[PDB]
Amino acid sequence: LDCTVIDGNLKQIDAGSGSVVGVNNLNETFVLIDNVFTKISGSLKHFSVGPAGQLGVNTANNIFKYQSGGFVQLAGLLKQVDAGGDQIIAGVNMYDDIYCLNMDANNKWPSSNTPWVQLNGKLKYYSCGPYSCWGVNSNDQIFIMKDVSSNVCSGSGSFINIPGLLSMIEVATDGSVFGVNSQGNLYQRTGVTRSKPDGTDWISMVACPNGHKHVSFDLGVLWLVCVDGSIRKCI
Amino acid sequence: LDCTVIDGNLKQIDAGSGSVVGVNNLNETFVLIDNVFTKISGSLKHFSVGPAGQLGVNTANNIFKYQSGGFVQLAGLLKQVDAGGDQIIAGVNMYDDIYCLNMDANNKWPSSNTPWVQLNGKLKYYSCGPYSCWGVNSNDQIFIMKDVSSNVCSGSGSFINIPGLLSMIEVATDGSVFGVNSQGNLYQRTGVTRSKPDGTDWISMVACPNGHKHVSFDLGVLWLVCVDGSIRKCILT
Ligand SMILES: *[C@@H]1O[C@H](CO)[C@@H](O[C@@H]2O[C@H](CO)[C@@H](O)[C@H](O)[C@H]2NC(C)=O)[C@H](O)[C@H]1NC(C)=O
Ligand SMILES: *[C@@H]1O[C@H](CO)[C@@H](O[C@@H]2O[C@H](CO)[C@@H](O)[C@H](O)[C@H]2NC(C)=O)[C@H](O)[C@H]1NC(C)=O
Ligand SMILES: CC(=O)N[C@@H]1[C@@H](O)[C@H](O)[C@@H](CO)O[C@@H]1O
Ligand SMILES: CC(=O)N[C@@H]1[C@@H](O)[C@H](O)[C@@H](CO)O[C@@H]1O
Ligand SMILES: CC(=O)N[C@@H]1[C@@H](O)[C@H](O)[C@@H](CO)O[C@@H]1O
Ligand SMILES: [Ca+2]
Ligand SMILES: [Ca+2]
Ligand SMILES: [Mg+2]
Ligand SMILES: [Mg+2]
């Protein structure tokens, strides 16, 4: 990895649809604008961007979607949310229960309901890509949901355990899968394709000299939050 | 129809995926950030946003996509580009030739061999939504491409003419279709469904009392640029 340092400090970063967003330890919300992390209105502990929009959650687990000029609350509660899927939203709540919203509901406004679908299982972190979603549970075990589509956000309905341990995991729009483990090591899943969505093995890489805290990938660029909150941008 | 005036001045506006973007007469590029049209770096004569990203074109007809902190030049030439399709790119070039880029290609970077698909026909303006794309030709005749999908961006391959005249047309993520004609009137297509993607008729509406220039719709909100460059934000009954 050839990386550069990007100025700023974050605890979480997400990249998708050409955007790069994140939050810092004070839960200030940032968008990468002309190569500068730029604060926007809001208080969020997790901020995601991708083909499903700009989605975040606050400390109280309220869910927000950026629309028509600002964050608007969506009905429900989640501790983490991802917008990487194919116009679907996915996330987990404080009890590690797993939810997704289908494209037809995501794109309906006004709405007198947000018809979340519960997935069978437990995860502390859940991220979606073009044809699958990956997550980890409270014991850092790794899972894939295959056959996810825009109006079948719940997929095949049966999670598959993928050997290994990760503390968080992100799925990119080109299908790439990266994660960080409890030791702050960084990994990519090799051999991931639409035909083989589970891929083949894990390979380690190093962007942060001091340990990695958070990772996301989009459009040939790997984004890292290091242990100290500093940011790396990698090809 | 209820409308308010929103501060700013543009020649073109697009809304999609909860974002609203546009360009002004100077080709300065704007994003609606915390309810204020905020200038970001870049020179573009058309700026689009939707599930396929933030896409634009400049005076030279070079194509740009916002990626990884700024605008990145793509391979190809377009005079107008739209990002409202299902992770596909669509547009027209200086000869009114029509192009789309499939989802898997749109998401691949670097892209040294970009597999643009040329569609059969001529349009001066082309916009995509969840299951179809709509466009108009240089004589303001209106066309739909049916059966468009993420990795068959060319759809059925055969454009169907829809009666009426429009100068531009935009398709929303919920399938709504709006357009503005050369006289500055504003229309919505009625009867549009997945089963009946071409819909059934046009209905006129008035947001700009002195004439409409450009329209886009996203998530229950209709956005107008009026003839004078002023902006309206409207909510339908
Ligand atoms: C920013 O958000 C984080 C996460 O919600 C806050 O840290 C949590 O604070 C709550 C009490 O509100 C505790 O129950 C949790 O143990 C904390 N979580 C973690 C991971 O530390 C943090 O306080 C917020 N920061 C500010 C400045 O408000
Ligand atoms: C902004 O962009 C527009 C569109 O490219 C420019 O207007 C065109 O100028 C070209 C010269 O390159 C003429 O050939 C066209 O007739 C013009 N088109 C239109 C619609 O006016 C305009 O000059 C640019 N403005 C600035 C300040 O850069
Ligand atoms: C994401 C979210 O808030 N999901 C909720 C779930 O918590 C709740 O139990 C249920 C009640 O019917 O509605 C939704 O599915
Ligand atoms: C993500 C993950 O669990 N990666 C593992 C790593 O922990 C382990 O140390 C290594 C050695 O066998 O194999 C894999 O790369
Ligand atoms: C989009 C479009 O072409 N609308 C036409 C309008 O031009 C015409 O004046 C009206 C009355 O015949 O019929 C349609 O509404
Ligand atoms: Ca993501
Ligand atoms: Ca559009
Ligand atoms: Mg003003
Ligand atoms: Mg799709």
**Three-state SS letters, A175-210:** CCEEEECCCCCEEEEECCCCCCCCCCEEEEECCCCC
Tokens of A26: 């004070």
∠ Cα B49 A42 B64 (to 5°): 20
Phi and psi for B106 in degrees, rounded to 5? -60, -35
- Hey, how many other C-beta atoms are within 10 angstroms of the C-beta on B147? 13
Q: Which residues have CB under 6 Å of ligand 1?
A: A 26-27, 45, 59
Rounded Cα distance between A69 and B132, Å, is 27
Chain B residue closest in CA terms to A64: B18
Q: How far is B15 from chain A (nearest CA, A)?
A: 8
With tokens 């993928």, the residue in question is: A162
What sign does the dihedral A113-A65-B171-A105 (CA atoms) show? negative
Q: Which amino acid is at B84?
A: G
What are residue A93's phi and psi, to 5 degrees?
Answer: -105, -175
Is there a contact between A68 and B173 if contact means CB atoms under 8 Å apart? no
Provide the H-helix boundaries in B40-186. 103-106
CA B141 to centroid of ligand 5, rounded, Å: 12
Asked whether B47 and B23 are in contact (CB, 8 A), the reply is yes
Tally: H helices and E strands in chain B: 1, 24
For residue B211, what are its two tokens?
């004439």
Name the residue facing A70 among B35, B54, B220 (closest C-beta). B35
Q: What's at B209, amino acid-wise?
A: P
Tokens 């229960």 belong to which residue? A97
| Cβ(B118)–Cβ(B98) below 8 Å | yes
Q: Give Cα separations from B161 to B97, B146, B164, B194 (angstroms).
A: 17, 11, 9, 18
- Count contacts between A and B (CB, < 8 Å): 107
Kindly compute the dihedral angle of the four CA atoms of residues B65, A69, B187, B122, in this order, to the nearest 10 degrees: 0
Closest chain A residue to B15, measured at CA: A68
Q: Where are the beta strands (DSSP E) in B9-145?
A: 12-16, 19-23, 28-33, 36-43, 46-50, 53-57, 62-67, 70-77, 80-82, 89-92, 98-101, 117-119, 125-128, 133-136, 141-145
**Amino acid, res. A189:** R
> What is the side-by-side order of every strand in the sheet holding A12-16?
A12-16, A19-23, A28-33, A36-43
Cβ distance of A18 and B67 shorter than 8 Å? yes
Ligand 1 atom with the smallest distance to the CA of A27 is 1
How far apart, in whole angstroms, are the C-alpha atoms of residue B216 and residue B237?
17
Q: Give the sheet arrangement for strand B80-82, strand by strand.
A: B80-82, B89-92, B98-101, B117-119
Q: Which amino acid is located at B218 in the chain?
A: D
Alpha carbon distance A135, A144 (integer Å): 7
Cβ pair B96, B124 in contact under 8 A: yes
Q: Contact B87/A51, CB-based, under 8 Å?
A: yes
Measured distance CA(A59)–CA(A109) in Å, rounded: 25
Task: List, in sequence order, the alpha helices (H) in A26-118.
Answer: 103-106
- Protein residue with least CA distance to atom 15, ligand 1: A59
Residues belonging to chain A: 235
- The residue among B212, B199, B197 whose CA lies nearest residue B164 is B199
Q: Which residues of chain A does B110 touch, with a Cβ-Cβ cutoff of 8 Å?
A: 220
CB nearest B108 (choices: A18, A86, A174):
A174
C-alpha distances in angstroms, A138 versus A77, A88, A116, B116, B219? 18, 24, 22, 44, 36
Q: Do A34 and B103 touch (CB under 8 A)?
A: no
Cβ-proximal residues to B204 (8 Å cutoff; 6+ apart), any chain:
B185, B186, B187
* Residues flanking ligand 2, CB < 6 Å: B 26-27, 45, 59
Choose among B41, B130, B218: nearest Cβ to A68. Answer: B218
Which residue of chain A comes nearest to B173, CA vs CA?
A: A107
Atom of ligand 5 nearest to the CA of B181: 1
The answer to whether the CB of B81 falls within 8 A of the CB of B53 is no
